[PDB]
């Protein structure tokens, strides 16, 4: 968490390209889960940070709860006067909500973070499995979760997909602009549910004997046989 002190939070709010792109994958993520129109649903925001994706969710009428570990992200989110509620915690220890709670889940650039072992007590696979199991717990049955990432290799992808398919989630991932570089995004979307004579001439060639040249009329019926 110690990146996002007051200085880096002040950087994060003062970045036009970053705000624009977070709004773009926030819109794409909200489009990617098929929540019904004119039904205000209840969502879980992961990697809310300053609440840019949370601000987009509040703009569309949906209600959301943000979860983060950096204090300056939540402080600047309060300073931005967001409408949703904030919670200060890590996904790797488990999301502390009842079963059948969230109608949808949106994670924005928050899932590639748990793929490496940084402390001696830490373990990436078990933390990711706990995170996915807690997602499967707190989500309502029949909901959908969209999880945005920028994988630096396929090791992170295989660990994330194994821990996702081991916690009971079903789905896949969709890549936006796979052939592009600037627009390539990863969205893990999960939810709680004549030939014969040719061969013979080749055979005679491997047996090393003289063969006729192979031409157009190789296998051709001469005439009807009565």
């Amino acid at each position: 968490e110690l990146f996002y002190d007051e200085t880096e939070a002040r950087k994060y709010v003062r970045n036009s390209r970053m705000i624009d792109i977070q709004t773009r994958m926030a819109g794409r993520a909200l489009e990617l889960l098929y929540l019904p129109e004119n039904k205000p649903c209840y969502l879980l925001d992961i990697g809310c940070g300053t609440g840019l994706s949370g601000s987009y969710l509040s703009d569309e009428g949906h209600y959301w709860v943000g979860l983060d570990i950096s204090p300056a992200m939540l402080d600047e989110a309060v300073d931005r006067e967001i409408e949703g509620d904030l919670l200060l915690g890590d996904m790797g220890q488990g999301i502390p909500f009842k079963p059948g709670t969230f109608d949808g889940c949106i994670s924005i650039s928050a899932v590639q973070w748990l793929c490496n072992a940084n402390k001696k007590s830490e373990n990436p696979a078990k933390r990711l499995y706990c995170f996915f199991a807690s997602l499967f717990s707190v989500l309502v049955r029949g909901s959908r979760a969209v999880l945005q990432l920028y994988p630096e290799n396929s090791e992170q992808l295989e660990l994330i997909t194994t821990q996702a398919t081991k916690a009971g989630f079903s789905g896949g991932m969709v890549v936006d602009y796979p052939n592009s570089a600037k627009a390539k995004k990863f969205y893990l979307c999960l939810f709680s549910g004549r030939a014969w004579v040719l061969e013979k001439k080749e055979r005679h060639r491997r047996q090393g004997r003289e063969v006729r040249p192979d031409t157009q009329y190789t296998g051709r019926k001469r005439k009807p046989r009565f």
Binding site: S154, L157, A164, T165, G171, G172, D176, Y177, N179, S180
Partner: protein, 58 residues
């Protein structure tokens, strides 16, 4: 040189997924039509929606 690097790292990701699949079956239970031949990029198609690629999870 960089084109071959892109091709080999994409092949490495694909083979790593295809080797992820068998232990996923054991212990448990991509944009080809969007290629642009003339140059690197992404061109819209009329019959299909905006470019994407879905690889479902097992």
């Amino acid at each position: 040189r960089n084109k071959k690097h892109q091709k080999l790292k994409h092949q490495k990701e694909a083979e790593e997924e295809e080797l992820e699949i068998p232990p996923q079956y054991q212990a448990g239970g991509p944009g080809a039509e969007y290629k642009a031949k003339k140059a690197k990029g992404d061109v819209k198609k009329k019959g299909r929606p905006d470019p994407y690629a879905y690889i479902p999870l097992n």
